[PDB]
Amino acid sequence: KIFKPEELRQALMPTLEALYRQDPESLPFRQPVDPQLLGIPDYFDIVKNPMDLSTIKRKLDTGQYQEPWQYVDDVWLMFNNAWLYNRKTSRVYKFCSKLAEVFEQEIDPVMQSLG
Ligand X SMILES: CCOc1ccc(C(C)=O)cc1NC(=O)c1cc(NC(C)=O)cc(NC(=O)c2ccco2)c1
Q: Which stretch binds ligand X (CB under 6 A): 5-13, 32-40, 58-66, 68-76?
A: 32-40
DSSP state of 36: H
List C-alpha distances in Å: 66 to 20, 58, 75, 79: 22, 14, 15, 21
Q: Which stretch binds ligand X (CB under 6 A): 2-10, 13-21, 55-63, 84-92?
A: 84-92
Binding residue for ligand X (CB under 6 A) from 8, 19, 82, 107? Answer: 82
- Verify binding: residue 24, ligand X, rule CB under 6 A: yes
List C-alpha distances in Å: 44 to 40, 75, 85, 113: 9, 19, 9, 37
Binding residue for ligand X (CB under 6 A) from 13, 18, 40, 102? Answer: 40
Residues 95, 102: contact at Cβ < 8 Å? no
Taking the C-alpha atoms of residue 60 and residue 78, their distance in angstroms, rounded to an integer, is: 15
- Verify binding: residue 20, ligand X, rule CB under 6 A: no
- Residues forming the site for ligand X (CB under 6 A): 24, 27-29, 31, 33, 38, 40, 82, 85-86, 91-92
